From Swiss-Prot:
Assembly: Interacts with EPHA3 (phosphorylated); dephosphorylates EPHA3 and may regulate its trafficking and function. Interacts with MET. Interacts with NCK1.
Cysteine persulfide modification, residue list: C215
Similarity comment text for this entry: Belongs to the protein-tyrosine phosphatase family. Non-receptor class 1 subfamily.
Boundaries of the shown chain within the full protein: 1 to 298 of 435
Protein name as annotated: Tyrosine-protein phosphatase non-receptor type 1
Free-text tissue specificity from the UniProt record: Expressed in keratinocytes (at protein level).
Gene: PTPN1
GO molecular function, one term: protein phosphatase 2A binding
Catalytic residues (UniProt): C215 (phosphocysteine intermediate)
Source organism (scientific name): Homo sapiens (Human)
GO biological process terms on file: actin cytoskeleton organization; cellular response to angiotensin; cellular response to fibroblast growth factor stimulus; cellular response to hypoxia; cellular response to nerve growth factor stimulus; cellular response to nitric oxide; cellular response to platelet-derived growth factor stimulus; cellular response to unfolded protein
């Protein structure tokens, strides 16, 4: 693929840092005035990472509609994502309100609650069936329904109830649990298999609201997941699959949320994932089961 050829070129000339910086320089800059209002200071995990005003998700509250979350709307791919930061101790109700209001079916979590010995986000979902959580501020109830723990990821079914109306929905929680504390996976196989599991669940589909994707800041790994998904989707859809330019797709996504893909390592890994995932796309059926075996599930 023209992508693989470009990949090897960048590798041989050792120019990932320069290409990544090119991305940083060309990326959109839009205002985040709502995020930066003093009253919202504690709704932000990093003063460094803010949703643009034009693409931010608004809570349907009268008293403060702010949450650190962005709608990424990929026109050609016909795919939408909500990228958000890992919930804060005081924003878990907001988070689940957003999931309810946006009609999301899936939540994708790409970080551990604790990494590098520090808390990367709040424990925002119940860990035991018998101990449900109530978010009083937004009047929502959340119950662990089942949990399936595999080697590289865990999938949970949750029941989210609007206590105000007593309607309930099933939310799928996809938790990639093995992203290394430093660097990137090194083999894209298990990440790809995880992406396919999210796809297979229907969570990414047009009949639902946009999937909610988060890591700690909601730009790095989150970025990588959405960039890979969209590129793969576009290669599937277009008459000329080799016309898919990762950098152009990334820059398009950066119109909707800043800082997507946080290092040159993550960029390289994005190429790797797309390239590898493209094998299962041009006819190769017997490779979905070569990512299920290359990475265990025990």
């Amino acid at each position: 693929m023209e992508m693989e050829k470009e990949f090897e070129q960048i590798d041989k000339s050792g120019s990932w840092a320069a290409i990544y910086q090119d991305i940083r320089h060309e990326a959109s800059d839009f205002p985040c005035r709502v995020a930066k209002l003093p009253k919202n200071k504690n709704r932000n995990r990093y003063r460094d990472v803010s949703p643009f005003d034009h693409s931010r998700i608004k809570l349907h509250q009268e008293d403060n509609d702010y949450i650190n979350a962005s709608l990424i709307k990929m026109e050609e791919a016909q795919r939408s994502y909500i990228l958000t930061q890992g919930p804060l101790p005081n924003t878990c109700g907001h988070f689940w309100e957003m999931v309810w209001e946006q009609k999301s079916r899936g939540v994708v979590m790409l970080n551990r609650v604790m990494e590098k010995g520090s808390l990367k986000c709040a424990q925002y979902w119940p860990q035991k069936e018998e101990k449900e959580m109530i978010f009083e501020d937004t009047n929502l109830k959340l119950t662990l329904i089942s949990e399936d723990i595999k080697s590289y990821y865990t999938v949970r079914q949750l029941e989210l109830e609007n206590l105000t109306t007593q309607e309930t929905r099933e939310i799928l929680h996809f938790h990639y649990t093995t992203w290394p504390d430093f660097g990137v996976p090194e083999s894209p196989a298990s990440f790809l298999n995880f992406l396919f599991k999210v796809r297979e669940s229907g969570s990414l589909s047009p009949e639902h609201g946009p999937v909610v994707v988060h890591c700690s800041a909601g730009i790095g790994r989150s970025g990588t997941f959405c960039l890979a998904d969209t590129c793969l989707l576009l290669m599937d859809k277009r008459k000329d699959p080799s016309s898919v330019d990762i950098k152009k797709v990334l820059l398009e996504m950066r119109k909707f949320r800043m800082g997507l893909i946080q290092s040159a390592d993550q960029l390289r890994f994005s190429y790797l994932a797309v390239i590898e995932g493209a094998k299962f796309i041009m006819g190769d059926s017997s490779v979905q089961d070569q990512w299920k075996e290359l990475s265990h599930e025990d």
